[PDB]
Fold Spike glycoprotein.
Amino acid sequence: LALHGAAAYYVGYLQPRTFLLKYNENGTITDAV
Amino acid sequence: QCVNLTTRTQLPPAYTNSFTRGVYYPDKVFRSSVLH
Amino acid sequence: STNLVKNKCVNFNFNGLTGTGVLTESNKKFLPFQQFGRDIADTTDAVR
Ligand SMILES: *[C@@H]1O[C@H](CO)[C@@H](O[C@@H]2O[C@H](CO)[C@@H](O)[C@H](O)[C@H]2NC(C)=O)[C@H](O)[C@H]1NC(C)=O
Ligand SMILES: *[C@@H]1O[C@H](CO)[C@@H](O[C@@H]2O[C@H](CO)[C@@H](O)[C@H](O)[C@H]2NC(C)=O)[C@H](O)[C@H]1NC(C)=O
Ligand SMILES: *[C@@H]1O[C@H](CO)[C@@H](O)[C@H](O)[C@H]1NC(C)=O
């Protein structure tokens, strides 16, 4: 961080999972299960 | 040189919830109009 | 490398990937980090 200001940060941890991803007609992921 | 910062109030840690966050593209193949 | 010929069935080699078929102009827009496009049956149907 830096010193002299308003900041907030969040940390989470990844696990091996199976996801169902949705691709629209432009190729972007818009939803997941 | 290293300086140990003082004058910092200690507080209990805080938690929150991730609402369907953290999804990334698994590979580099283009796909469209599909459930994968 | 040879010339690019369209609208005819032609054996093709793209960056080492070989196949047969007919090439047409596409409206798909690839993000900069991708090179091939694949359909539901997982076969390659688009190429930059
Ligand atoms: C900030 O505080 C740490 C203590 O957490 C100091 O590190 C210690 O330094 C002494 C002397 O070099 C060592 O005997 C200890 O083992 C160190 N402790 C740890 C946990 O490493 C550090 O020197 C301080 N920084 C300053 C005074 O600038
Ligand atoms: C998120 O995780 C934290 C850390 O495990 C949970 O905090 C604990 O909650 C239980 C039950 O309320 C307490 O008995 C523990 O003392 C808490 N630990 C700490 C370090 O505070 C928290 O409940 C979890 N869920 C939410 C919604 O915050
Ligand atoms: C897809 O691309 C078209 C053309 O750029 C754009 O108009 C549209 O908003 C995009 N998104 C969707 C969901 O169709």
In short: Strands of chain A lie at 21-23, 29-32. DSSP finds no helices and two strands in chain A.
